[PDB]
Short mmCIF file of C-alpha atoms in Angstrom, two decimals:
data_model
loop_
_atom_site.label_atom_id
_atom_site.label_comp_id
_atom_site.label_asym_id
_atom_site.label_seq_id
_atom_site.Cartn_x
_atom_site.Cartn_y
_atom_site.Cartn_z
CA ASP K 1 158.32 72.22 96.82
CA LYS K 2 156.43 75.51 96.84
CA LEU K 3 155.34 75.05 100.50
CA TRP K 4 158.78 75.32 102.13
CA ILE K 5 159.70 78.56 100.38
CA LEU K 6 156.23 79.99 101.01
CA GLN K 7 156.69 79.27 104.71
CA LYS K 8 160.16 80.86 104.76
CA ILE K 9 158.92 84.02 103.00
CA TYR K 10 155.95 84.17 105.41
CA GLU K 11 158.38 83.88 108.33
CA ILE K 12 160.50 86.78 107.11
CA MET K 13 157.36 88.91 106.85
CA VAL K 14 156.44 88.11 110.46
CA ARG K 15 160.00 88.56 111.76
CA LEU K 16 160.29 91.99 110.07
CA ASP K 17 157.09 93.17 111.77
CA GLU K 18 158.21 91.93 115.21
CA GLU K 19 161.55 93.68 114.78
CA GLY K 20 159.79 96.97 113.91
CA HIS K 21 160.55 96.85 110.12
CA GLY K 22 156.88 97.33 109.16
CA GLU K 23 157.52 98.90 105.75
CA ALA K 24 159.75 96.02 104.64
CA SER K 25 157.16 93.54 105.93
CA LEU K 26 154.58 95.11 103.57
CA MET K 27 157.01 94.59 100.72
CA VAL K 28 157.39 90.90 101.60
CA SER K 29 153.56 90.67 101.85
CA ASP K 30 153.36 91.80 98.19
CA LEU K 31 155.73 88.97 97.21
CA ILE K 32 153.55 86.40 98.95
CA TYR K 33 150.55 87.71 96.99
CA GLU K 34 152.46 87.51 93.71
CA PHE K 35 153.90 84.09 94.45
CA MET K 36 150.55 82.47 95.20
CA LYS K 37 148.83 84.10 92.18
CA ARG K 38 151.12 81.77 90.18
CA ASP K 39 149.89 78.25 89.45
CA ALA X 46 75.15 105.23 107.75
CA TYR X 47 75.52 107.55 104.72
CA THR X 48 75.30 111.30 103.98
CA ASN X 49 74.94 113.49 100.86
CA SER X 50 78.21 114.84 99.36
CA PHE X 51 76.51 117.99 97.92
CA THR X 52 79.25 119.98 96.09
CA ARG X 53 82.14 118.81 98.34
CA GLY X 54 85.05 116.68 97.04
CA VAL X 55 86.31 119.23 94.46
CA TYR X 56 90.12 119.69 94.34
CA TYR X 57 92.49 121.44 91.93
CA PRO X 58 93.27 118.80 89.24
CA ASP X 59 96.82 120.18 88.75
CA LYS X 60 99.33 122.97 89.57
CA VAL X 61 97.98 125.00 86.59
CA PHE X 62 96.67 128.54 87.25
CA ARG X 63 93.47 129.53 85.40
CA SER X 64 91.73 132.89 86.01
CA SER X 65 88.04 133.81 85.44
CA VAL X 66 87.55 130.76 83.16
CA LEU X 67 85.49 127.54 83.07
CA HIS X 68 87.73 124.46 82.69
CA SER X 69 86.41 120.94 81.94
CA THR X 70 88.63 118.26 83.53
CA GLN X 71 88.17 114.45 83.59
CA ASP X 72 89.77 113.01 86.75
CA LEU X 73 89.08 111.00 89.93
CA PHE X 74 86.45 113.24 91.59
CA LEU X 75 83.83 112.61 94.29
CA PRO X 76 80.46 112.56 92.46
CA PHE X 77 78.08 115.39 93.47
CA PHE X 78 75.28 114.40 95.91
CA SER X 79 76.81 110.89 96.17
CA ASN X 80 76.54 108.74 99.33
CA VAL X 81 79.54 109.36 101.64
CA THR X 82 79.97 106.80 104.45
CA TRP X 83 79.86 108.63 107.82
CA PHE X 84 81.26 107.40 111.16
CA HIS X 85 80.82 108.86 114.68
CA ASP X 99 84.39 102.70 113.96
CA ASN X 100 87.78 102.49 112.16
CA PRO X 101 87.30 99.67 109.60
CA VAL X 102 89.77 98.58 106.86
CA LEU X 103 88.08 100.71 104.16
CA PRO X 104 88.94 100.07 100.48
CA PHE X 105 91.07 102.91 99.01
CA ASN X 106 89.80 102.30 95.42
CA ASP X 107 90.89 104.98 92.90
CA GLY X 108 91.06 107.68 95.61
CA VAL X 109 89.63 108.65 99.01
CA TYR X 110 87.87 111.88 100.02
CA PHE X 111 88.06 112.24 103.82
CA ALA X 112 86.09 114.88 105.76
CA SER X 113 86.86 115.33 109.48
CA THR X 114 84.32 117.25 111.61
CA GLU X 115 86.01 117.34 115.03
CA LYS X 116 87.12 119.79 117.76
CA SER X 117 89.22 117.40 119.94
CA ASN X 118 91.46 116.25 117.01
CA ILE X 119 90.06 112.69 117.37
CA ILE X 120 91.38 111.89 113.86
CA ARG X 121 95.11 111.42 114.51
CA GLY X 122 96.19 109.92 111.17
CA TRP X 123 95.71 107.47 108.26
CA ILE X 124 97.39 104.18 107.23
CA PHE X 125 97.41 103.07 103.55
CA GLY X 126 98.44 99.53 102.58
CA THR X 127 97.81 96.86 99.91
CA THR X 128 97.96 94.02 102.50
CA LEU X 129 97.98 96.09 105.76
CA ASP X 130 100.90 93.98 107.12
CA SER X 131 104.71 94.19 107.57
CA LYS X 132 105.07 91.82 104.55
CA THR X 133 104.70 94.83 102.18
CA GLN X 134 105.71 98.45 102.96
CA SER X 135 102.80 100.86 103.67
CA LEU X 136 102.35 104.66 103.98
CA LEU X 137 101.24 105.98 107.40
CA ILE X 138 100.60 109.62 108.41
CA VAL X 139 100.36 110.41 112.16
CA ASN X 140 99.88 113.84 113.81
CA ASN X 141 101.75 114.77 117.03
CA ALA X 142 100.90 118.51 116.49
CA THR X 143 104.65 119.40 116.49
CA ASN X 144 105.43 117.33 113.34
CA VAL X 145 103.09 115.15 111.23
CA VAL X 146 105.09 111.96 110.54
CA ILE X 147 104.61 110.45 107.04
CA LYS X 148 106.40 107.11 106.63
CA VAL X 149 106.54 104.80 103.58
CA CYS X 150 108.06 101.85 105.45
CA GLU X 151 107.30 98.25 106.52
CA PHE X 152 104.95 98.24 109.55
CA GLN X 153 103.05 95.42 111.31
CA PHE X 154 99.83 97.22 112.32
CA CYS X 155 98.06 96.47 115.61
CA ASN X 156 94.58 94.85 115.55
CA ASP X 157 93.10 98.18 116.78
CA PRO X 158 95.79 100.82 116.06
CA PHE X 159 95.36 104.23 117.75
CA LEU X 160 97.01 106.89 119.96
CA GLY X 161 95.89 106.75 123.63
CA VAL X 162 95.46 110.11 125.40
CA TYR X 163 95.43 110.34 129.23
CA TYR X 164 94.18 113.25 131.37
CA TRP X 171 95.30 115.75 128.06
CA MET X 172 98.55 114.17 126.79
CA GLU X 173 99.07 111.36 124.23
CA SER X 174 100.62 108.55 126.33
CA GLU X 175 100.09 105.37 124.24
CA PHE X 176 101.12 104.56 120.63
CA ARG X 177 99.36 101.27 119.72
CA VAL X 178 99.89 101.51 115.93
CA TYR X 179 102.60 99.12 114.69
CA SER X 180 105.21 96.66 116.02
CA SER X 181 107.57 96.86 112.99
CA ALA X 182 109.46 99.84 111.50
CA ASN X 183 111.75 98.07 108.99
CA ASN X 184 112.85 98.66 105.34
CA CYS X 185 111.93 102.30 106.05
CA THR X 186 112.00 103.81 102.54
CA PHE X 187 110.63 107.31 103.28
CA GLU X 188 110.33 109.44 106.45
CA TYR X 189 108.88 112.98 106.48
CA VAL X 190 108.37 115.33 109.47
CA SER X 191 106.11 118.25 108.47
CA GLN X 192 104.16 121.11 110.07
CA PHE X 205 82.37 121.38 115.32
CA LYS X 206 84.02 124.73 114.44
CA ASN X 207 86.65 122.99 112.26
CA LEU X 208 86.14 120.94 109.05
CA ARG X 209 89.29 119.35 107.58
CA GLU X 210 88.95 117.93 104.03
CA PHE X 211 91.66 115.62 102.62
CA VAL X 212 91.78 113.97 99.18
CA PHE X 213 94.23 111.04 99.07
CA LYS X 214 95.14 109.93 95.53
CA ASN X 215 97.86 107.37 94.68
CA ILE X 216 98.61 107.72 90.93
CA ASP X 217 101.78 107.02 88.84
CA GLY X 218 103.58 106.10 92.10
CA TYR X 219 102.96 109.57 93.61
CA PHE X 220 100.55 109.85 96.57
CA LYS X 221 98.91 113.27 96.95
CA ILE X 222 97.03 114.83 99.90
CA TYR X 223 94.75 117.78 99.06
CA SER X 224 93.78 119.61 102.29
CA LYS X 225 91.27 122.39 103.09
CA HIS X 226 90.12 124.04 106.37
CA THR X 227 86.51 125.24 106.71
CA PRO X 228 84.94 127.14 109.66
CA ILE X 229 81.60 125.32 110.30
CA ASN X 230 78.74 125.46 112.84
CA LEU X 231 76.60 122.45 111.78
CA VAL X 232 76.00 119.91 114.60
CA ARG X 233 76.34 116.84 112.33
CA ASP X 234 76.87 115.65 108.71
CA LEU X 235 78.37 117.55 105.76
CA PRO X 236 77.48 121.28 105.72
CA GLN X 237 76.15 122.42 102.30
CA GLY X 238 78.88 124.61 100.77
CA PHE X 239 81.61 124.88 98.11
CA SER X 240 85.31 124.80 99.05
CA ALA X 241 88.23 124.23 96.66
CA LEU X 242 90.61 121.54 97.97
CA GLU X 243 94.17 122.91 97.61
CA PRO X 244 96.95 120.30 97.15
CA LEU X 245 98.76 120.21 100.52
CA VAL X 246 101.45 117.54 99.95
CA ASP X 247 102.62 115.28 97.08
CA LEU X 248 105.16 112.49 97.75
CA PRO X 249 107.00 109.95 95.48
CA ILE X 250 105.68 106.78 97.17
CA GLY X 251 105.57 104.09 94.45
CA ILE X 252 103.81 101.27 96.39
CA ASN X 253 100.37 99.72 95.72
CA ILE X 254 97.63 101.20 97.97
CA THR X 255 94.39 99.15 98.00
CA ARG X 256 93.05 99.65 101.56
CA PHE X 257 93.31 102.36 104.23
CA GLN X 258 92.36 102.91 107.88
CA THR X 259 92.02 106.22 109.79
CA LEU X 260 93.62 106.30 113.27
CA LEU X 261 91.45 107.92 115.98
CA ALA X 262 92.62 109.34 119.33
CA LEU X 263 90.77 106.83 121.56
CA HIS X 264 91.05 108.37 125.05
CA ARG X 265 91.64 106.05 128.04
CA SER X 266 88.67 106.00 130.45
CA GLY X 276 88.50 100.41 128.42
CA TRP X 277 88.57 103.05 125.64
CA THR X 278 85.94 105.81 125.14
CA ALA X 279 86.52 108.40 122.37
CA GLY X 280 85.40 112.05 122.38
CA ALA X 281 82.57 113.26 120.10
CA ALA X 282 83.74 113.61 116.46
CA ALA X 283 82.69 112.56 112.93
CA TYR X 284 84.67 111.33 109.89
CA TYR X 285 83.27 110.78 106.37
CA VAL X 286 84.85 108.63 103.63
CA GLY X 287 83.95 108.92 99.94
CA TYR X 288 85.41 106.89 97.06
CA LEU X 289 86.51 109.02 94.09
CA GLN X 290 85.26 107.93 90.64
CA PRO X 291 86.41 108.94 87.12
CA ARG X 292 84.17 111.99 86.55
CA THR X 293 84.19 115.04 84.26
CA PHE X 294 83.92 118.32 86.21
CA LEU X 295 83.46 121.87 84.88
CA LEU X 296 85.30 124.13 87.37
CA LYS X 297 84.73 127.91 87.53
CA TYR X 298 88.10 129.54 88.32
CA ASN X 299 87.59 133.14 89.55
CA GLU X 300 90.00 136.10 89.14
CA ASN X 301 92.12 134.60 91.99
CA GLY X 302 92.33 131.17 90.27
CA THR X 303 90.31 129.63 93.14
CA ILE X 304 87.62 127.13 92.06
CA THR X 305 84.47 128.94 93.24
CA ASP X 306 81.94 126.49 91.74
CA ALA X 307 81.86 123.14 89.90
CA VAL X 308 79.43 121.19 87.69
CA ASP X 309 79.33 117.37 87.69
CA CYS X 310 78.81 116.61 83.97
CA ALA X 311 77.05 113.29 84.78
CA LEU X 312 75.00 114.45 87.83
CA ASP X 313 71.76 115.44 86.00
CA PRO X 314 70.54 116.51 82.51
CA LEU X 315 70.80 120.23 83.48
CA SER X 316 74.44 119.59 84.54
CA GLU X 317 75.02 117.67 81.27
CA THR X 318 73.69 120.73 79.37
CA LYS X 319 75.96 123.05 81.41
CA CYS X 320 78.98 120.81 80.66
CA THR X 321 78.10 120.56 76.94
CA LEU X 322 77.66 124.36 76.63
CA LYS X 323 80.94 124.81 78.63
CA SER X 324 78.99 127.53 80.51
CA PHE X 325 77.56 127.71 84.06
CA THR X 326 74.46 129.46 82.64
CA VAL X 327 72.58 128.01 79.63
CA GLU X 328 70.38 130.28 77.47
CA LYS X 329 66.74 129.42 76.71
CA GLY X 330 66.52 126.74 74.01
CA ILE X 331 67.13 123.07 73.12
CA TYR X 332 70.62 121.54 73.51
CA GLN X 333 71.96 118.12 72.43
CA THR X 334 74.12 116.77 75.30
CA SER X 335 74.74 113.04 74.69
CA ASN X 336 73.30 109.96 72.95
CA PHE X 337 70.98 107.44 74.65
CA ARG X 338 71.64 103.81 73.63
CA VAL X 339 70.19 100.54 74.96
CA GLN B 340 114.59 135.19 67.30
CA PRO B 341 115.34 134.59 71.03
CA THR B 342 118.40 136.65 72.08
CA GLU B 343 119.61 134.08 74.66
CA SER B 344 118.47 130.96 76.57
CA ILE B 345 117.56 131.04 80.29
CA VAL B 346 117.06 127.83 82.34
CA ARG B 347 115.22 128.07 85.68
CA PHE B 348 115.19 125.24 88.26
CA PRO B 349 114.12 125.23 91.96
CA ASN B 350 116.64 126.96 94.30
CA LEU B 354 121.34 117.97 102.29
CA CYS B 355 122.85 114.52 101.69
CA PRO B 356 125.09 113.53 104.66
CA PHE B 357 128.38 113.48 102.70
CA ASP B 358 130.05 115.28 105.61
CA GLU B 359 129.23 112.24 107.78
CA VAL B 360 131.01 110.06 105.17
CA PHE B 361 134.14 111.93 104.13
CA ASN B 362 134.95 113.60 107.43
CA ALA B 363 134.17 110.62 109.67
CA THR B 364 136.59 110.09 112.55
CA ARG B 365 136.99 106.36 112.06
CA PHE B 366 137.29 104.53 108.72
CA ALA B 367 136.89 100.79 108.22
CA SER B 368 139.60 98.30 107.29
CA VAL B 369 139.45 97.46 103.61
CA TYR B 370 138.63 93.77 104.22
CA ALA B 371 135.60 94.94 106.22
CA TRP B 372 134.86 97.90 103.97
CA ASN B 373 131.97 100.05 105.09
CA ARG B 374 128.85 100.78 103.00
CA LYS B 375 126.63 103.83 103.66
CA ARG B 376 123.26 103.94 101.82
CA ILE B 377 122.33 107.48 100.90
CA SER B 378 118.75 108.30 100.01
CA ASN B 379 115.96 110.86 100.28
CA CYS B 380 118.22 113.85 100.01
CA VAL B 381 119.70 116.48 97.71
CA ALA B 382 123.45 116.69 97.17
CA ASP B 383 125.76 119.28 95.66
CA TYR B 384 128.01 117.10 93.51
CA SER B 385 129.60 120.21 91.94
CA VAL B 386 131.78 120.60 95.00
CA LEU B 387 133.07 117.06 94.97
CA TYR B 388 136.35 118.71 94.07
CA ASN B 389 136.25 119.96 97.70
CA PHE B 390 134.25 117.35 99.59
CA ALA B 391 137.38 116.51 101.50
CA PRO B 392 140.90 117.84 101.59
CA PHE B 393 143.87 117.22 99.32
CA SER B 394 141.60 114.86 97.51
CA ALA B 395 142.20 113.00 94.30
CA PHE B 396 139.15 111.98 92.45
CA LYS B 397 138.07 110.33 89.29
CA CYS B 398 134.61 109.64 87.94
CA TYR B 399 134.19 106.73 85.52
CA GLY B 400 130.68 107.69 84.38
CA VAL B 401 129.81 111.32 83.55
CA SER B 402 131.36 114.48 85.04
CA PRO B 403 130.51 115.53 88.65
CA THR B 404 128.51 118.50 87.26
CA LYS B 405 126.21 116.20 85.26
CA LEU B 406 125.66 114.29 88.53
CA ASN B 407 123.94 117.50 89.72
CA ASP B 408 121.31 117.26 86.96
CA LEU B 409 120.87 113.54 87.54
CA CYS B 410 118.75 111.81 90.10
CA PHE B 411 118.98 108.22 91.40
CA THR B 412 117.02 105.97 93.69
CA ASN B 413 120.04 105.27 95.85
CA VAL B 414 123.65 106.34 96.21
CA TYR B 415 126.22 104.05 97.89
CA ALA B 416 129.30 105.31 99.71
CA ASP B 417 131.93 102.64 100.35
CA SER B 418 134.89 103.64 102.52
CA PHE B 419 138.08 102.08 103.89
CA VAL B 420 141.83 102.55 104.31
CA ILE B 421 144.60 101.07 102.14
CA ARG B 422 148.19 101.89 101.17
CA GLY B 423 148.89 104.74 98.77
CA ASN B 424 150.32 102.39 96.15
CA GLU B 425 147.09 100.32 96.28
CA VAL B 426 144.69 103.19 95.46
CA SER B 427 145.22 102.43 91.74
CA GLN B 428 143.44 99.09 92.36
CA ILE B 429 140.16 100.83 93.24
CA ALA B 430 139.31 101.22 89.57
CA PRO B 431 137.37 99.07 87.05
CA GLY B 432 139.37 96.26 85.47
CA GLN B 433 142.18 96.13 88.11
CA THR B 434 143.78 93.08 89.71
CA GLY B 435 146.00 92.91 92.80
CA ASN B 436 145.90 92.03 96.49
CA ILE B 437 143.15 94.57 97.17
CA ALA B 438 141.05 94.21 93.99
CA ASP B 439 141.24 90.43 94.23
CA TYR B 440 140.69 89.75 97.99
CA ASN B 441 139.33 92.91 99.66
CA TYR B 442 137.27 95.36 97.53
CA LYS B 443 136.38 94.83 93.88
CA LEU B 444 134.74 97.25 91.42
CA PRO B 445 132.99 95.87 88.29
CA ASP B 446 134.47 96.23 84.83
CA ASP B 447 131.52 98.48 83.90
CA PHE B 448 131.78 100.71 86.97
CA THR B 449 130.43 104.24 86.46
CA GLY B 450 130.88 106.01 89.76
CA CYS B 451 133.50 108.11 91.48
CA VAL B 452 136.61 107.11 93.43
CA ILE B 453 138.09 109.65 95.87
CA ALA B 454 141.26 109.07 97.89
CA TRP B 455 143.39 111.21 100.18
CA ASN B 456 146.55 110.66 102.26
CA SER B 457 145.59 110.06 105.91
CA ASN B 458 149.11 109.71 107.36
CA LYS B 459 148.46 112.27 110.12
CA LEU B 460 145.33 110.46 111.29
CA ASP B 461 145.94 106.77 110.66
CA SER B 462 149.66 106.30 111.21
CA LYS B 463 151.07 105.83 114.69
CA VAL B 464 154.51 105.72 116.18
CA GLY B 465 155.04 102.07 117.00
CA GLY B 466 152.53 101.09 114.30
CA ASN B 467 148.77 101.38 113.95
CA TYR B 468 147.68 97.75 113.99
CA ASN B 469 143.93 98.51 113.61
CA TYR B 470 143.95 98.44 109.80
CA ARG B 471 144.06 95.03 108.13
CA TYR B 472 143.75 93.53 104.62
CA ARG B 473 143.17 89.95 103.44
CA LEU B 474 146.29 88.28 102.00
CA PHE B 475 144.95 84.79 101.27
CA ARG B 476 141.69 83.66 99.63
CA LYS B 477 140.59 80.59 97.64
CA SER B 478 138.97 82.69 94.90
CA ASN B 479 138.77 86.29 93.75
CA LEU B 480 135.96 88.42 95.03
CA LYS B 481 133.01 89.21 92.88
CA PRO B 482 132.21 92.86 92.41
CA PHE B 483 131.02 94.55 95.63
CA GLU B 484 131.56 91.31 97.56
CA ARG B 485 132.74 91.65 101.17
CA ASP B 486 134.48 88.86 103.11
CA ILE B 487 134.97 89.28 106.85
CA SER B 488 135.75 85.61 107.65
CA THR B 489 138.86 84.76 109.70
CA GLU B 490 139.27 81.09 109.02
CA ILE B 491 142.82 79.88 108.99
CA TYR B 492 144.01 79.57 105.40
CA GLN B 493 145.26 76.07 104.69
CA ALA B 494 148.05 76.48 102.15
CA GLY B 495 149.15 72.86 102.17
CA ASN B 496 147.52 69.44 102.53
CA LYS B 497 147.63 69.13 106.33
CA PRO B 498 144.64 70.42 108.37
CA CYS B 499 145.08 73.49 110.53
CA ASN B 500 142.59 72.53 113.24
CA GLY B 501 141.73 76.20 113.62
CA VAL B 502 145.27 77.34 114.58
CA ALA B 503 147.95 79.26 112.68
CA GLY B 504 151.14 77.28 112.07
CA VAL B 505 153.31 76.03 109.24
CA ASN B 506 151.45 76.51 105.96
CA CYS B 507 148.38 77.49 108.00
CA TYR B 508 148.06 81.25 107.88
CA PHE B 509 145.77 83.73 109.59
CA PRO B 510 144.19 85.31 106.49
CA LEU B 511 144.36 88.98 107.49
CA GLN B 512 147.56 91.04 107.76
CA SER B 513 147.93 94.44 109.41
CA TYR B 514 149.43 97.37 107.53
CA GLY B 515 150.98 98.57 110.83
CA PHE B 516 151.08 102.17 109.54
CA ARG B 517 153.87 104.38 110.91
CA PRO B 518 154.43 108.12 110.21
CA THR B 519 157.84 107.42 108.73
CA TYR B 520 156.68 105.20 105.90
CA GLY B 521 157.14 106.38 102.36
CA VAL B 522 154.09 107.92 100.72
CA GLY B 523 153.51 104.75 98.69
CA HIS B 524 153.12 102.88 101.99
CA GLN B 525 151.24 105.56 103.96
CA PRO B 526 147.50 105.16 104.61
CA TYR B 527 144.93 106.59 102.21
CA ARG B 528 141.28 107.00 103.09
CA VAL B 529 139.09 106.05 100.12
CA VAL B 530 135.45 106.76 99.28
CA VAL B 531 133.67 105.11 96.40
CA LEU B 532 130.34 106.53 95.19
CA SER B 533 128.12 104.25 93.13
CA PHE B 534 124.81 105.53 91.67
CA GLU B 535 121.89 103.13 91.48
CA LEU B 536 118.89 103.68 89.22
CA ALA B 541 114.73 108.67 92.28
CA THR B 542 115.00 110.05 95.78
CA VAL B 543 118.58 111.29 95.48
CA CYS B 544 119.14 114.31 93.30
CA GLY B 545 121.74 116.91 92.50
CA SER B 549 120.12 127.95 87.09
CA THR B 550 120.45 130.91 84.67
CA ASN B 551 119.97 134.61 85.60
CA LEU B 552 116.39 135.77 84.82
CA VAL B 553 116.02 138.36 82.01
CA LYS B 554 112.87 140.52 81.67
CA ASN B 555 111.09 142.02 78.61
CA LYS B 556 113.45 140.22 76.17
CA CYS B 557 112.56 137.55 73.56
CA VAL B 558 114.22 134.43 75.06
CA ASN B 559 113.91 130.62 74.97
CA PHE B 560 113.09 129.70 78.59
CA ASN B 561 113.17 126.36 80.44
CA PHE B 562 111.11 126.43 83.67
CA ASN B 563 111.38 123.05 85.48
CA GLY B 564 111.08 121.20 82.13
CA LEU B 565 108.59 123.68 80.61
CA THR B 566 110.38 124.72 77.38
CA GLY B 567 109.01 127.79 75.59
CA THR B 568 109.91 131.04 73.79
CA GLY B 569 108.67 134.56 74.57
CA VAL B 570 109.21 137.77 76.58
CA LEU B 571 108.89 137.53 80.39
CA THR B 572 107.15 140.54 81.99
CA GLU B 573 105.79 141.45 85.45
CA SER B 574 102.31 140.01 86.18
CA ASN B 575 99.34 141.03 88.37
CA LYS B 576 97.86 137.49 88.39
CA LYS B 577 97.51 136.04 91.92
CA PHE B 578 98.70 132.45 91.40
CA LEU B 579 97.65 129.94 94.05
CA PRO B 580 100.71 128.55 95.93
CA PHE B 581 100.47 125.08 94.28
#
């Protein structure tokens, strides 16, 4: 379902920020936005 | 009680300059020789069309004026107060005190019992008996105008007989209904006993006035076209002096 | 016939306080400054701030100088460079949808400048946040500062972030080394409500001209006068 992959994407975003990859976290943020704008 | 207006209450109707000419203008003017209410009391006086205010004082007892439709914080009102350094004019929501005033202690103003609310403050303006101060307050088309004049006087009481043009001092874009007003006096602390002073309030009425502008453009004399048949003749002839003869001024109808 | 036209008009709004403020708000908590009872020189918008980029959606900044308005609103916040394009009428995106939304019929000005030197920090500036989740799009000029946990699935979150239960704000974490697209931009939006907020030709003498003095339109020759006008 949509909820597992949402959670995995969210987790990557968080992990990237904790590991200092802020810029790549912003890019994953944009994907979350796009994904949830779908039905 | 009441006093005679004489020729006082004349102000420049507009910012137009006229020199050595007689101009007939219909506007809210204080009728000549009308009854002006005198006080030596700060009631909630009706503002009506406009208010002519004469202050005969040496101790600056008159410290300001409040103008409001309901005189409460429910609707915004316009208040002018004088601290000498900067007159404060505020079109804002204020909840006035039952007996608003500025309390002076021996002399320095120490108490400000005027309002408890300063909210929705739309407009704030800080600006700059041997002394007579005349002020015409008119609220028209949303603009409120104060016409002010200073006169050196030596009469003990009541309005001195004289002519003084009332120059427009300030005009502000207010835009709120003004139905009642109240002057604020400097009630000194003894229990409150105020110093000797007098203030006179007159209600302007729609009147036609013939004003004589001199070479300087100052109104040196005025004729109230409805005051008396001689004044009606002067207004009809558009001249301050009428020649010998018969003149038709108006029509009498029952 | 008149040789030329001369227009005469009389000879400050705290725009310095707005554009050169030390702190700016996060976009999700965008700041609104009401400006009123003042005169502003909108001609110099081109230089109200530095390295600016501006666009007006109503009339030119010059025409703003003629105009008057009851109130002016200044909205300000920080976002990413690549998100500045969303602060425009008719846009959709993470910012337009969940943070700050202009109406389709907006007629104001949008000004944005790169604030990398001020708002980025080594290690990350975590002050600046944006909303990433919301149950509906924002209406124009709506502001949402709630921080309720966003429940993405069917299980309750009982007020704590967890699986499919997301804190609704995210930090930009700005760092000096980000690309320009990801660097911080300070943004000011001016909207003009409708007049206590308001925005001259050389005088010629002894020449037949069509003159405009404070709305008095006339034709004639202007010469020196000995008339003592009263000040009013």
